[PDB]
Ligand binder design. Structure first.
Ligand SMILES: O=C(O)[C@H]1CNCC(O)(O)[C@@H]1O
Length: 451
């Protein structure tokens, strides 16, 4: 007994344009202590990034960016030649790590194998303005202007008052004083240096005051989002999401600087075993990419590394890399590709309320629809109107249970080594122009492409 829902596509209801560099990943700065990780020799990880997008952004930052120190004469230690730095769990201070010129040289070679651009964290929490300027000069020289999208001056500065990085009295005004001092030092050595911020954890009250004070000094505004957890809770809206969406919309409405979600994943403190590492996270992540794009976001960076519960890609240079379940929701987005969002209204859906749908006119002119049946107990039958085409094909995003940590496929295939992926099962959509009908099992996703 599927829940019978209507989906009306309205090509006259033009939404936001999704740019080619929308997709992205975030890693801990501590990983730059291992020059083998972001390296030309890491062909496996480079292939996972290429499969997520021809263009995209690598963001390096996180809690460890306050505990990582640039040393222009240093070489890496024994332990850090083998370091796989997973997401910081945010319980206490991270271990001190050193970043070497060799690590920045190898990062350039890595980025050049991918086509991706870089957002690079500087140490405003514990470092000096002069050391930041020295690091920025080396990064700008080596990575180059076309691949360096932005420096960010600290990670989650809105938590320095609580985590001991600053006094209890630290507030936006104190942060703006620190930010101006680092900005001035860096621009003295790197007059072309680009910036973004404030890279906040959650405090939306900082976004527009940052944008207004530093309007002539930044390329875009950035903030973070974590949904925390149970799988049922992850499939629903929550107040924190509503607040972050409202913050993004205030930036777009009050400034005309673009916004990027520079660090996001399902559950903070490194994720939750049984939620973040499950097929549910693929549906959560693919739905999030579209919801934020529909709300006016220019891009996203899913946090990860090591074998963290929420990482899209898990592994090490020594042991190899694998796509975790969340990767498959980002792979649906990659396959849908860039374009402009169209209206897509669901009706008769109160029985299947966690079903989401997004329509897109691709750069090639063809209509695509991304659906996420996030209902854990309801199959749906989707009557699709407003789409004119002889023919459509469906790629399904599936696992046998929402809590599965494996068995995830897209287009009837898993991702293989080095991000290898091609569709092996493609089905025609039942119906004809102006009336297509699509069945979806409970807890599943679909990408429809029309001729
Ligand atoms: O708590 C987490 O999972 C995140 C929160 N944001 C900072 C971080 O990326 O360093 C951390 O790993």
């Amino acid at each position: 007994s599927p829940v019978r829902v209507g989906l009306s596509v309205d090509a006259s209801a033009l939404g936001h344009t999704i740019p080619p560099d929308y997709t992205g990943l975030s890693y801990e700065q501590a990983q730059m202590a291992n020059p083998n990780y972001f390296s030309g020799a890491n062909t496996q990880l480079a292939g996972f990034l290429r499969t997520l997008g021809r263009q995209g952004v690598l963001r390096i930052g996180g809690n460890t960016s306050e505990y990582t120190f640039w040393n222009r004469h240093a070489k890496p230690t024994a332990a850090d030649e083998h370091l796989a730095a997973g997401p910081d769990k945010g319980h206490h201070a991270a271990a001190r790590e050193v970043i070497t010129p060799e690590a920045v040289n190898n990062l350039s070679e890595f980025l050049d194998k991918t086509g991706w651009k870089l957002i690079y964290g500087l140490n405003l929490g514990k470092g000096t303005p002069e050391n930041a300027a020295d690091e920025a000069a080396y990064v700008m020289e080596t990575i180059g202007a076309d691949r360096l999208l932005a420096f960010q001056l600290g990670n989650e500065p809105d938590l320095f008052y609580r985590n001991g990085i600053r006094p209890a009295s630290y507030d936006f005004a104190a942060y703006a004083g620190d930010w101006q001092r680092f900005f001035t030092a860096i621009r003295k050595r790197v007059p072309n240096a680009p910036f973004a911020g404030p890279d906040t954890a959650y405090n939306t009250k900082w976004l527009v005051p940052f944008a207004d004070k530093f309007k002539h000094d930044v390329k875009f505004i950035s903030s973070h989002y974590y949904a925390e957890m149970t799988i049922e809770r992850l499939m629903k809206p929550n107040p924190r999401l509503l607040g972050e969406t409202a913050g993004l919309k205030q930036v777009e409405a009050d400034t005309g600087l673009p916004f990027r979600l520079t660090e996001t994943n399902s559950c903070y403190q490194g994720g939750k075993q049984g939620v973040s590492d499950t097929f549910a996270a693929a549906l959560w992540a693919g739905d999030l990419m579209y919801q934020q794009a529909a709300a006016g976001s220019t891009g996203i960076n899913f946090h990860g590394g090591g074998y963290g519960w929420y990482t899209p890609v898990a592994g090490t240079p020594e042991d190899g890399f694998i796509a975790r379940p969340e990767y498959y929701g980002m792979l649906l987005f990659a396959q849908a590709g860039a374009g402009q969002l169209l209206g897509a209204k669901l009706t008769d859906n109160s029985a299947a309320p966690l079903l989401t749908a997004y329509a897109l006119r691709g750069t090639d002119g063809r209509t695509r629809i991304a659906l996420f049946n996030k209902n854990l107990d309801a199959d749906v039958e989707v009557a699709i109107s407003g789409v004119a085409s002889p023919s459509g094909t469906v790629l399904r995003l599936e696992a046998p249970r929402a809590d599965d940590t494996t068995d995830v496929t897209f287009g009837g295939a898993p991702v293989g080594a080095s991000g290898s992926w091609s569709p092996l099962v493609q089905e025609y959509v039942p119906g004809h122009s102006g009336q297509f009908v699509l069945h979806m099992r409970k807890a599943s996703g679909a990408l429809l492409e029309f001729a």
